[PDB]
């Protein structure tokens, strides 16, 4: 199981305490809020730098 996860064939981790294999179901359907946040922060820092340089 460890080898399979490290090969990116398994989307999940292992609970060795309880002898359990928890797999990430990745049902959130996101990965777009991350792009929105990156865009927001990058362009707002961009605007702040532009305003500071122009002032």
């Amino acid at each position: 199981l460890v080898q399979c996860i490290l090969d990116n064939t398994i989307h999940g981790r292992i609970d060795q305490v309880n002898q359990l294999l928890e797999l990430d179901h990745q049902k959130r359907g996101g990965a777009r809020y991350t792009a929105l946040d990156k865009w927001t922060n990058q362009l707002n820092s961009l605007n702040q730098a532009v305003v500071s340089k122009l002032a």
Binding site: L1, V2, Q3, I5, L6, D7, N8, I10, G12, R13, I14, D15, Q16, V17, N18, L20, E22, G30, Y33, T34, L36, D37, T40, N41, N44, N47, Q48, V51, S52, A55
Partner: protein, 412 residues
């Protein structure tokens, strides 16, 4: 720093594998950094330094051997240099050098570029044997001018690379490696020697990612390369740097695809097991072999400072990969995945979380390491609110600036 005490080095093989001034430098550092074995290391060093008419470093080595022998004469309660060598060595060294100099200067009156280049290279080789670094460089730096063919350029690059390693002018090595590689249209494996020199120079220049990449491209067909670095240390140099920088999939591809590092790993089965244990998540056996590799290779020339940083990186990377496929990772089991204690791992884990790239939370109650999977949206909203607050503050600042500039408010 270094100069630690540890036994079991094989002096005969390490001295015989290398040859030249590189061997002379290797014997001196090994003697200087490995006590309780410095005498035989110095005795073998001086026995080889007197060959090829050395002058200045001989006095330093003879003085060190004289001190070492004097120390041996007081513990279980100094050799003569035979200064007849000085009379003999100087008289022979001068006469042959003057004869060679007379020929080259006459050849300079004959005006042949290749002959001038070849003679200057011979003068540089003699000066290096005599123990004259800068003198060889100027001879080599006059041979660089009179080049005619691509092979002449390659020989010119190799000589400058060899000298600048002793001079520790690694910038000149890297510049000549780039010149020798990029220029002539990127059985005689010439690029392999250049890649080996670049990897050693980069590693001595505190570089690991590019040095391992260059070392992995080195073909084993080069075989005998004792003027710079032995194949045994080359495999070790590549393996340690690859383990510290190359990730799992990066490691697996590069080692297998090269097919020459597999031969290199055959030369050093210890690092081969270390990499294999690293792949199979057996870091307990991986690191205990690493500590065994620590003492045997911390008395190495260009490794001793860098190996400690490399080993520290290896320990960090091993911990990161181990915890990655774990949700409720028991810190007892993670501690049991090495010879470390529970408290020591907890301190190491806490340091890794502070630095980062482990993304975990420590539950000291049951001593279980729980991975952190924060909601993207909550963090996004928090930092967006912070950005809005900062934007409002900066807007207030700009409005105040405009107000004070419009009203001409300034200290006179």
């Amino acid at each position: 720093n270094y100069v630690v005490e540890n036994p079991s080095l094989d002096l005969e093989q390490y001295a015989a594998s290398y040859s030249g001034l590189m061997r002379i430098e290797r014997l001196q550092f090994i003697a200087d950094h490995c006590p309780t074995l410095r005498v035989e290391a110095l005795k073998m060093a001086l026995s080889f330094v007197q060959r090829t008419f050395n002058v200045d470093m001989y006095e330093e080595i003879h003085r060190k051997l004289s001190e070492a022998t004097r120390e041996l004469q007081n513990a279980p309660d100094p050799p003569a240099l035979d200064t007849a060598w000085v009379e003999a060595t100087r008289k022979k060294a001068l006469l042959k050098l003057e004869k060679l100099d007379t020929d080259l200067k006459n050849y300079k009156g004959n005006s042949i570029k290749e002959s001038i280049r070849r003679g200057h290279d011979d003068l540089g080789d003699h000066y290096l044997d005599c123990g004259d670094l800068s003198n060889a460089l100027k001879c080599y730096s006059r041979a660089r001018d009179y080049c005619t063919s691509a092979k002449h350029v390659i020989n010119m690059c190799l000589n400058v690379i060899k000298v600048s390693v002793y001079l520790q002018n690694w910038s000149h090595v890297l510049s000549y490696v780039s010149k020798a590689e990029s220029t002539p249209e990127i059985t005689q494996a010439i690029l392999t020697k250049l890649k080996c020199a670049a990897g050693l120079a980069e590693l001595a220049a505190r570089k690991y990612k590019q040095a391992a990449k260059c070392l992995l491209l080195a073909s084993f067909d080069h075989c005998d390369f004792p003027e710079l670095l032995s194949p045994s240390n080359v495999a070790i140099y590549g393996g340690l740097c690859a383990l510290a920088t190359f990730d799992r999939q990066e490691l697996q591809r590069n080692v297998i695809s090269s097919s020459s590092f597999k031969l290199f790993l055959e030369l050093e089965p210890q690092v081969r097991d270390i990499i294999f244990k690293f792949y199979e998540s057996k870091y307990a056996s991986c690191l205990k072999m690493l500590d065994e590799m620590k003492d045997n290779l911390l008395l190495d020339m260009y490794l001793a400072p860098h190996v400690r940083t490399l080993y520290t990186q290896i320990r960090n990377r091993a911990l990161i990969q181990y915890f990655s496929p774990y949700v409720s990772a028991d810190m007892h089991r993670m501690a049991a995945a090495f010879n470390t204690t529970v408290a020591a791992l907890e301190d190491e884990l806490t340091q890794l979380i502070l630095e980062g790239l482990i993304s975990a939370r420590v539950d000291s109650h049951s001593k279980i390491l729980y991975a952190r999977d924060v909601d993207q949206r909550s963090t996004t909203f928090e930092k967006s609110l912070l950005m809005g607050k900062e934007f409002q503050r900066r807007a207030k600042a700009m409005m105040l600036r405009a107000a004070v500039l419009r009203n001409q408010i300034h200290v006179k």
